[PDB]
């Protein structure tokens, strides 16, 4: 069992692709418990052209989305192990979002850390909760539940 | 005015491409409610990655879309149609709560945003409501955001 | 097989972002006619330069959509719904004539494509029809296109 | 009213912007007469991602759009000469198009040359006709009427 | 083999894709010897939205990148002839860059031409040098050593 | 001059913009002397769509561009100081590039640190040498001569 999971590994599990794959690396994975990953925030991202001009602030909902993706990594894997074939048939459905609070704006230069831990699961359904952090300080908090749907 | 088109939204809201997710405004009640909408089309960059071969408007972006409609209701409530101020402000998400996604939103759908204020208090606003495609609740959520100074 | 959604459209037409301008086929009748549409939203790249501070959907893209709708008509009319014969048949534009733009299309409009066959000769199709938004005609044209081999 | 114009000049005159500004240079111009300009076609254009994957073709409709923009340049400069403060207050709108023929496909590498003569003009409404040429060969034929409107 | 290649061919040999495929057509080619190709520069390129606003200047570094790809096409072609199947398995790593000189700026409407000659070469390593030219004039000269490393 | 500048400062001094502003933050700065800045590298960059499909590698040539800009920023503040004004006027333009060595491919998740120090400098022609590093190690090195045009 490996510790870190790089972009190539991520591409092999999550179905998300540019410009919606918002997780760059996985520094810690504990099946069925807690995942710690991150996405680098640079100014060279199309999203900054509109949010907002002359004041780049990484969208709050995209922080949520990032945590949701970090969680999804937990789901797919825990549910099948690091297996790209069994993962290529799925996608991830967002079911609920709760108790999310944004505390510090994220901007170019910040290492957006996703700290999530499972809270409950079953089948393709999983509920995860946690925070997003920059340089150790909390930037956001959230709870969300998702399903690993079928491409069909 | 009770209806507004993209021209006005561009003058009021600080958001721009690719983060302005509201096209037209159909109802507005200062300090009360506002319904609006955003057309979803395949000709949008997000669909390149969400998800290849299976385009699905990101759930988080439906929420953003509802937050913007609120922001527009908020801004006009505090200053009226005022382009010179809007450029001095930005919107900032505070919290998001009890948001549920029920039917996926796809290219071809007229994504309606229905919101009503629940807590007005100053710059800080709080609204709740649903997103609807063809008279059907596709999502629901409550959110709070602050219209604060730019810098 | 009367209503076709974006999913079905990707499997028939070779066009992809940012040049697939048809979001859903609402009517289709072999070798005769097709009714489809594409939603116009602000979150489209084209709007960054046409025109800044005044989003106007390009008339030529409206023609492009009508042609693409017609191409869907050709493909299915000639081979029913076949996702692979289609992976080997681009859509080349031959002529356009009698086109007229009447009402500017903008973000928030549903652009409906109404086309009928004027003449079919193998893979050389001549069509004609209009472009409508919320009831009124917005553009009208006639065009010819060939569904040649992809190489 | 010089005869040759570079993108720098085109920007101040035409309201069109990326990714809808399809004229890089003006080779020749004669008030209310004719205009010759061109647009280089490269693979490095977003339009090519979808038209068509694995087979790059510059859309015919854009060739038409390009000629319309050339006429526009010509019309702007004819109506008011080289003037950026009046131009800033205008937009160009397509009125009609007729007798367009697409003879040869345009692809990355080709130098898309536009050729237009004025068929009729009165006020903001201008009518022009001509061809689009690559290496001398007539790639396409087109006729169109466009108007200059106040951005208001 | 050949000595004239278009974008369909280029695409079949080099792994670069949008927005980093900076070579449109190969006009001249001599195995092991030299190579001449070009890329059309047009305002309808994303890079101009920022380099620079209201003053389009094709990035100097991108001129260099264009010469390396041209060198890469030449290298690949020299090593295996025209072979898409085998090329399909390679990447092009940049090794060293030297004696890079920018003389004239490259702007929209220019025909950025690549002139490369093979200095040294052993395995999947080729040190080449040449110049970038627009209208016969040398807009830049440079040297580099790329790497044709297998793709995985 | 100061010693900590954020994208909001960089924006006000460099002319580059999306998708060519390749410097996100300036952590350390000593006028006429050196500068230490950096650009975050994420997968969410358009460039990775073509360099390369299923194997994103930040282009070495963009690493150099990022180094140049850093020096450029150093150059301006190292004469007129953080002064948006003159800045809007003048404008960076690199005339040469020497001794560029690429040692480790940069990929999404790296924090490309820019380490530049002033070298053989004229007046409007600043030369700079230094390196780009990731997690302490040297991913690349290079020397550039830049002129503050107008
Ligand atoms: Cl936010
Ligand atoms: Cl979602
Ligand atoms: Cl076409
Ligand atoms: Cl138009
Ligand atoms: Cl440069
Ligand atoms: Cl490289």
Automatic annotation (TrEMBL), chain F:
Transmembrane segments: none annotated. This is 3-hydroxyacyl-[acyl-carrier-protein] dehydratase FabZ. InterPro entries: FabA_FabZ, FabZ, HotDog_dom_sf. Its main location: cytoplasm. It comes from Helicobacter pylori. It comes from the Bacteria. One of its GO terms (molecular function) is (3R)-hydroxyacyl-[acyl-carrier-protein] dehydratase activity. It is found in: Cytoplasm. The active site is at 51. It catalyses: a (3R)-hydroxyacyl-[ACP] = a (2E)-enoyl-[ACP] + H2O.
